[PDB]
Amino acid sequence: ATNRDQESSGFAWWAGNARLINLSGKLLGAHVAHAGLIVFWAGAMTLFELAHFIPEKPMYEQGLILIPHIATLGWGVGPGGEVVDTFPFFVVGVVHLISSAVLGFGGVYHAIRGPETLEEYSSFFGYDWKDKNKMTTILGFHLIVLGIGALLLVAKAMFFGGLYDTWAPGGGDVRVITNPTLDPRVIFGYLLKSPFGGEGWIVSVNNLEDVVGGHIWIGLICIAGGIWHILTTPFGWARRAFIWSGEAYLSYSLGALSMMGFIATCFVWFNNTVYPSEFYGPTGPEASQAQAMTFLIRDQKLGANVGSAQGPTGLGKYLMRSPTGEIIFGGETMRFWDFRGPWLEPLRGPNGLDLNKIKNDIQPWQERRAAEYMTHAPLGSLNSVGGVATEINSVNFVSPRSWLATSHFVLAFFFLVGHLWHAGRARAAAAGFEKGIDRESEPVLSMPSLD
Amino acid sequence: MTILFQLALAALVILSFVMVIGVPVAYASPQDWDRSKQLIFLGSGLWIALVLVVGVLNFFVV
Amino acid sequence: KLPEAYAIFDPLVDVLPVIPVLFLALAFVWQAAVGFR
Amino acid sequence: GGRIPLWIVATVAGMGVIVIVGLFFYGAYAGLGSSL
């Protein structure tokens, strides 16, 4: 029972996994077993979703988060996001479920049976946290792996049937990407975009050519950087800037996952390109715009002149200007005029919403989509009663966008907390005061009084 | 094919439940570890064979 | 729905996604077995 | 002294709590209180 009590390890049971910091073999077990947990959930969850799935209802009426991910890759779906073949969903679920048994096998073996430390056994697989060169080497391997993952997405998009494209001319459809964006001015231009309204930083990506192109860059950057890290040791300025310890490295990764968690939250909330509204439901901005569109269509059908209709406030009841002059929907949805979506764009001209097009060109498919999106707004209760908070029971609906944004905000937040926890602990432990103040060497007692 | 398929899938399921309990118990057990390592190797190769069998038989029943 | 050949395994498929939660709870059964030492 | 180990009493007792609370949640979706 080597290091498996507090007396010998220094760590109580509730901090038991900290007992693993310098036991690379059992720690590899923990890590591989955990990767099996992730892969397991992905496979079991997909099969569960598929078993429950009624192909003719929207995915977003069915509490689905995984099938939508598979569909966006262009598997299983045709024009408009119509499901044409559930078999690719089945394949995805089963292959992960089977794969998780393999990882679970390796995890249990390393955790429970294999060498507790790897250093004696192997110098390639063994490691010392304080070995800066071995650390950047392992980091380099993982970077190469991630770079290959990014290129797998490019391979799907370009050579293995394309991706679902909500923006495809004539209507959403799977489309092969032949001209991915390679111009670094466009690709890296996204990273320098403001995160505020009408800009949206990288969340603004609105076409699959930029999406594919960005992953070409990212795949190459990761592979190059991974090679770089295998062949270099950290520079002196790096050495002096960081703490070099397992807990420190955990902390940096916790910060990065927290940041990524917040980014994903905003991505699923606003973006309707890599989270097609056909599969995930309308965004909050989209549903609010769709409501204004709905009533403009209705009332104009009744004979209203929607361009000249002054609302109670003096602003146009249906149509008004943005602060820079663009014609936009009126009422509260004024806030959402940055919204763009395939059912609305045909009505927008160089000056914003075009009154001529509004009066003459609104098609029944646009009326339908706007009614669907207005009535699937991502508002709903914790027990999945769809609608505003005062709604009566009847409609069992909470948008996949709300489930995904809320979950990831919670996770990202606690990951920031874990970052602070571990970053601060790693600093104290490196300097030797994580267990308390030395009563005979209390720093403040050697300091001059403040006053 | 449905007989072969459904037996092969039930077998895979059952062997899985056995391995799920048996592998950790074998790994953390003192005695009879020699008779265990063999069964684990046998179970594993059999588990893998059944997956491939179910995978192939799938297309004769779907 | 699952392809018809697998329908018999529907109730099993309904319960699998919860298994990860069980791994967390298992850690506590195990620790209780070793007296949270 | 005790013949039955404390970790088993805990595990069985905990599982019993999960079952009865599980049943109460099932009941939120069926019969009275279900909105249906």
């Binding site: 029972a1 429970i112 | 439940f17 799920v20 309990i21 950790p24 118990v25 953390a28 057990s29 003192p30 005695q31 | 529907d10 109730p11 099993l12 309904d14 319960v15 919860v18 298994i19 069980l22 791994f23 709870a25 298992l26 059964v29 195990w30 077995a33 070793v34 | 180990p5 970790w7 088993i8 595990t11 599982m15």
Partner: peptide, 29 residues
Amino acid sequence: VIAQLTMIAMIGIAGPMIIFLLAVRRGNL
């Protein structure tokens, strides 16, 4: 309903069964 309950019943017992078997046999817990 009985089907899913039976499934989770034997899935649920598998974990504590592992610990029980190991404890009886004085395994490496």
